[model samples]
Target: EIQIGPGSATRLEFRRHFAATPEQLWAALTSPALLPAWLFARGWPMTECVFEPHKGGLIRQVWTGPEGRTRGLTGRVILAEPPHRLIHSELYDTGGETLVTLQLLPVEGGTELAMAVDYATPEARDAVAASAMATEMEEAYRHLDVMLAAL
Candidate 1:
């Protein structure tokens, strides 16, 4: 997962395929404890998070930068389907809000995960792409790959 960026006018997409079962992938993606291990820790280390996996539940993600600046996202689950799909609305520290959807599908060797985000505008999409998206995701997913390999 070297790439992570924006998508269509209605969506910005990211895709990753892992050599693990849908169940395994789902666990890794949703497990709160495993999150810190795979979440972006280069630009910003995830210090804490609250994930309520059920539909209509709440989600909170917090990260602390090297310089001690704090960033976070909070929202409610719009939809949740185990080992399959998750839809949520996330409000970032920058006050930008996006609708995030995660889709998981079984693949030959493992599973394919597609993450799509609906930003408010093209400029919002550009802002996200211009930021730490690539750097953060590359390292984060690399860590995830390692952890999944161990399992």
Candidate 2:
């Protein structure tokens, strides 16, 4: 429950420690090969994913769900500091923009990863805090734990 800035500019931080090197964690994040294993639905059919791993590069992921629902998100990478940090475009709701930042700090024998989503205003932040996406991300972190364990 870390806080950043104040009121309209505030951001919340969620941190987790993985028993894997920063390089391994970064690979898990940037590699399409590892995405579905933890970030997407099981057997999620990915039509395409392109990651340039640099500022201004486009990142996109397209997939179909079990119910034949096709969905995707495409955004430009604002920052890509390998094995250390990544900050990039964020998608909120159907038509909203936010900033997503990931920081990786090397720990004893692994890395401490922290994620932050910064919205434009307090209302937007509060709205997202109450949204299902928030819960979904929490669940995703648990899945990430399982994924890391298998690595």
Candidate 3:
């Protein structure tokens, strides 16, 4: 399940569970090759997927929308505890910067993924909350579920 909380005016929180090991999920999330496969489930095709999963490393992904619009995120890894936790900063192509923190915990049947995104302002957070982000994310995660089940 995916939960998007009204966390705060400047922050958005999401909780999801995956029937996969943390290591597997982490790879699916960070590995450049695997990332593009599921991260763009809204019909947007990722044109670039580059990740340096280490402190001070770069994290970037660019996707082309249906009407030829391009949206992407460029960021640096602030902390990386491989397969467990990651904290980073993202600067989106549209605008604004947000800090993201993700945690993976081994649960009863698999892993529980918790994510938080903190925007620079309430308006920025509202914009994303009003967008298709949550739906697209669920679609992408469904793709991830299939991909993980096959492994």
Candidate 4:
């Protein structure tokens, strides 16, 4: 497991082995069709997702959630080595100042994803954790599992 941060830290880790190969996993992560299966808000269509898949490339995602809630985030690709690792910058809540580091590591038969959020304060973390959106993460992972199983 990739250790991100300690107590009161806004960190997240997810691990899973897919029957598919590393290239397939990469596609699942970068592709528009597959990404939403694991990492999107409900009823949110990924209208735009573009990635150059290289260092310094820009990555952006735009989605329209329930109740006309349209949101998007854009960041620089810090590292993008195919089938092995990818690191990128992320922002929260459209305009939140907190910066995040998202790293994806390819393991023996799966991928391990680690996310570290550098919030301005511990209260920010608490607020995020208490939100309904935070609770959707588990469900998203569950959906990912099902999608991978079906593959």
Candidate 1 Cα errors over 4 Å, as ranges: 1-6
- Per-residue alpha-carbon lDDT of candidate 4 for residues 1-151, written as tens digits (9 for 90 to 100): 2232353555434444445566776787766667866776568866777766678887788888777777887877777777667776767463255555545566666766555565566666667666765456556666766777788
Better of 1 and 4 by TM-score: 1
How accurate locally, in lDDT, is each candidate? 0.82, 0.74, 0.89, 0.64
Instruction: List candidate 2 segments past 4 Å from native.
Output: 1-10, 41-47, 92-95
Poorest lDDT segment (10 consecutive residues) of candidate 2: 1-10
Q: After superposition, how far is residue 118 of candidate 1 from its true place, in Å?
A: 0.4
lDDT of 2 by residue, 1-151 (tens): 2222332445766777778888988998888778776676554566677766788988788877787777888777898888798888866235368788889999786788888877777767776667666556656667777898976
Please list the residue runs of candidate 3 whose C-alpha ends up more than 4 Å from where it truly belongs after superposition: 66-68
Give lDDT tens digits, candidate 3, residues 55-78: 999998899988888888899999
lDDT of each residue in 1-151, candidate 1, tens digit only: 5445456755677888789988888888887888887886766777887888788898899999887899888999988899899888999865278998999999787888888888888778778777766666767888999999987
Report the C-alpha displacement of residue 150, candidate 2, in angstroms.
2.1
At residue 57, candidate 1 shows an lDDT of 90
Q: Pick the candidate with the highest lDDT.
A: 3
Please give the lDDT score for candidate 4: 0.64
